[PDB]
């Protein structure tokens, strides 16, 4: 629960990595996305991913 030195834990089964980590921290990494890592991806990454069978003649 506490080491006194700082504000986290060593291991222990429950309580620790229980409903932190993937719950609160990098929650912005996906909400900001769907528009930045999805919106800049409709005419550039596809611009170079079809070239594989067609230009081969």
């Amino acid at each position: 629960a506490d080491k006194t030195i700082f504000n986290d834990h060593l291991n222990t089964n429950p309580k620790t990595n229980l409903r932190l980590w993937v719950a609160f921290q990098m929650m912005k990494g996906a909400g900001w996305a769907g528009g930045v890592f999805f919106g800049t991806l409709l005419l550039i990454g596809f611009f170079r991913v079809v070239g594989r069978m067609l230009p081969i003649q």
Binding site: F6, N7, D8, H9, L20, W21, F24, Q25, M26, K28, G29, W32
Partner: protein, 250 residues
Amino acid sequence: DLASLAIYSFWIFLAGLIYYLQTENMREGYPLENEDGTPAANQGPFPLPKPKTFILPHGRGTLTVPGPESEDRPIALARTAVSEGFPHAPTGDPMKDGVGPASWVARRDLPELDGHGHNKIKPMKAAAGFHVSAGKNPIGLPVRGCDLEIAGKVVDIWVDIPEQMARFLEVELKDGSTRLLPMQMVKVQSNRVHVNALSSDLFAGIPTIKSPTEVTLLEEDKICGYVAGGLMYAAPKRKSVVAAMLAEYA
């Protein structure tokens, strides 16, 4: 005139305009002082000018500037390198001696004055100008510190008129002993507030404003500087803070 004349009243009358201008920006701050209180290395190629008379907006004296420059206020850095260059480190904890990222200064006991005959910054229980009388109105919600835990409850606003603005967000403690905190760092989204500067168990270390309605210019230095104190150290070293202090976007 001619084809070769006018570019010379310029390579001269302005070739000293970085010179004349620099000194006029080198009023405050200079002279240079060492790491103790000593006539330091020098000043530069554009040394500081001897100041002219400064008249103040509400009769605050003959405060010429550059003005007070000596060692009035307390400083507490244990000189690691006696040689001038390598940095210095505070005594105990750096957020008690007031050294490093958290800065303040000692001034005269006359707060910032406007022209109406009254002070500058007052709460909403010091100006019955704009109120609450339609629908449900949000002036009273819980908060959260950088430790990712609830910190207090803010239920008031310090009003402004000339700028029609805001400067502080007052926190009602469990008790009532006053505390303060800046305005631009804040990052509020829905129904709870999140500050990412100070932990929720280091808010009492922020001075109680001598008056809950007045901010003297003496007080307005640490009160908006303690949060900067937690923008440098915070926080060694492992786990949650690494997923809190780093990354982010805004």
